[PDB]
């Protein structure tokens, strides 16, 4: 059983995501991977569907993971995870191994968890495998050169959603809320949570909480992309904290049919103070910001944020 982490100082020194990977400077998802591996421990197996945290970390013919890791397709992150779980539970039962049951973690991108890997995700929760499925969310297909995704915000600029006269906002679609998708309909699902790199301790505790569960767990982590969202490499944590403080990302634990907010927002800032710091929203007019805000208000109502916008 993985104990609760009291503070940053009382967090373990051991790294299981070592220095040396071809990730962007100040990569949000890289910190995500580091914190998850730190909270997981040595008894962990990582499944990495094709994306930044696969390609960038492994370039070339190497890897930063101190624990076992295998590549998966972007289409079968959870499907492969299901097999590794079933194998160990079978190899152990038939006394074909002395290995203890390991922590089985999927590090899927938003595309591989919300879009093209959703089917393999839902079915793992359905079969109730003891596997921790994590989505690191940079709100785009980042490794392919920043393309639109179901988690990409409305009016965001991507190579698949460029702003033009015909499509002034670039992306007309409002994002899909994957945490809410899988939180319902799966009887075996025991723990759902959303986390942010702005809150590293809260993140690691949620991971350990998911690992401690006697079933499948899912954690949707917000991971700002400096390259994709177009902002300086030293403002990633400022983007992560601002995203929560403005209501763009909601921190909670949905358990037993009820939401439990993680961070206390006394007053939330308008989205414009968050979108103006990112050149991916630099094309949007005040009508678009209003539509974003109205959406965020409705999104915040779903989790229980009743406070008005300041």
């Amino acid at each position: 059983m993985l104990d609760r982490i009291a503070s940053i100082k009382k967090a373990p020194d051991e790294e299981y995501y070592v220095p040396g990977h071809r990730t962007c400077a100040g990569c949000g998802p890289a910190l995500t991977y580091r914190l998850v591996a730190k909270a997981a421990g040595p008894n962990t197996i990582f499944i990495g569907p094709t994306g930044c945290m696969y390609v960038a970390n492994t370039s070339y013919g190497c890897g930063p993971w101190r624990v076992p890791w295998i590549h998966a397709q972007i289409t079968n992150g959870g499907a492969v995870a299901s097999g590794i779980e079933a194998a160990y539970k079978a190899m152990i039962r038939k006394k074909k191994t002395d290995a203890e049951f390991p922590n089985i973690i999927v590090m899927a991108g938003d595309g591989g968890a919300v879009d093209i890997g959703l089917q393999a995700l839902s079915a793992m929760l359905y079969r109730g495998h003891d596997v921790l499925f994590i989505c690191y969310d940079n709100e785009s297909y980042a490794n392919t050169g920043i393309q639109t995704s179901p988690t990409t915000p409305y009016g965001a600029n991507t190579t698949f959603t460029p702003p033009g006269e015909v499509v002034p906002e670039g992306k007309k679609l409002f994002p899909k809320d994957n945490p809410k998708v899988i939180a319902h309909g799966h009887p075996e699902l025991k723990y759902v949570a959303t986390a942010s790199i702005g809150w590293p301790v809260d993140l690691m505790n949620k991971v350990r909480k998911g690992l401690n569960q006697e079933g499948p767990a899912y954690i949707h982590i917000h991971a700002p992309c400096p390259k994709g969202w177009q902002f300086p490499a030293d403002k990633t944590i400022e983007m992560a904290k601002l995203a929560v403080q403005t209501g763009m990302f909601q921190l909670y634990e949905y358990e037993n049919g009820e939401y439990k907010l993680s961070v206390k927002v006394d007053k939330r800032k308008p989205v414009s103070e968050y979108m103006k710091l990112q050149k991916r929203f630099a094309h949007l007019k005040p009508e678009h910001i209003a539509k974003m805000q109205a959406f965020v208000d409705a999104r915040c109502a779903e989790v229980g944020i009743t406070v008005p916008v300041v």
């Binding site: 100040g26 890897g63 624990v67 177009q230």
Partner: protein, 295 residues
């Protein structure tokens, strides 16, 4: 048996993402200005990372080019650096041909630059231009992976740097290059204010492990040393350090180790993102240029 004397190779090093567009626009403007030309971004460097040494290659010839399908220029004639710290820890002088020119974007003196280069080899000329003051660096998500650039060509610091290259080699006319760039004015500055100085006269199969499977590292991934990404490095003031280790928990590259003396910063892999400086609540960290150091 396959040499091309009329073919000049140009290798343009740059920092990823922040100056990837700039390095490309430099190459593109020249090829458009010229003869038989080829312009492309190093496919190997893709996808570009922040502050990673990337490259843009150029080939201009009076005869038909028959070496187009080669990823990289293996024998460069012109080496161009858009960022100053690229002289440190980056193999920018590999395979350089005689009668070559080194173009660097900096305000620093030539003598200081030579202290990091060592032997210039077949390098004939060195050129420096302060394009930073003349133009502004441009970034966009458009014009990626082969897409067209809606912002155009030679919009930012591309033309003033490219103009400085012309002053030493004279590969293309200024007016021809001024007709493909968004700022011909900044180009004229780079072409005029450029300071030119003349310089003195089977196994791969054995190296392939089972199915490409490699063992997990223990303390570090030596397969990807990222210290040479640094344009700047974090410097600590230990009398200002509260040892809260806020920096330690926010480092994406695990380059900080908690000791009894406080946070120790690993300069072997540090990419110098400056997050630790930005998230430090005590202000004991400061971002200082990499070229102020010899190690």
């Amino acid at each position: 048996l396959f040499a091309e004397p009329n073919l000049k190779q140009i290798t343009v090093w740059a920092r990823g993402v922040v100056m990837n567009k700039d390095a490309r626009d430099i190459v593109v403007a020249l090829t458009e200005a010229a003869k038989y030309v080829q312009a492309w971004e190093n496919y190997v460097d893709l996808p570009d990372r922040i502050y990673v040494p990337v490259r843009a290659y150029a080939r201009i010839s009076s005869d038909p080019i028959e070496s187009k399908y080669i990823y990289e220029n293996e024998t460069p004639d012109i080496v161009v650096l858009v960022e100053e710290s690229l002289i440190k820890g980056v193999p920018i002088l590999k395979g350089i041909r005689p009668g070559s020119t080194l173009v660097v974007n900096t305000k620093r003196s030539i003598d200081t630059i030579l202290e990091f280069l060592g032997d210039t080899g077949n390098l004939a000329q060195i050129v420096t231009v302060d394009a930073n003051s003349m133009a502004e660096a441009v970034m966009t998500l458009s014009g990626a992976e082969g897409a067209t650039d809606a912002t155009g060509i030679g919009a930012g610091i591309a033309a003033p740097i490219a103009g400085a290259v012309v002053k030493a080699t004279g590969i293309v006319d200024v007016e021809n290059l001024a007709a493909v760039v968004k700022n011909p004015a900044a180009m004229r500055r780079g072409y005029a204010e450029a300071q030119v100085r003349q310089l003195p006269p089977t196994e791969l199969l054995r190296q392939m492990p089972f199915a490409g499977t490699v063992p997990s590292p223990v303390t570090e991934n030596e397969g990807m040393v990222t210290g040479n990404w640094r344009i700047q490095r974090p410097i600590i003031d230990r009398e200002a350090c509260t040892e809260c280790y806020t920096c330690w928990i926010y480092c994406p590259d695990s380059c900080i180790t908690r000791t009894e003396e406080g946070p120790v910063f690993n300069m072997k892999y540090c990419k110098g993102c400056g997050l630790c400086t930005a998230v430090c609540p005590s202000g004991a960290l400061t971002n200082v240029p990499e070229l102020d150091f010899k190690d």
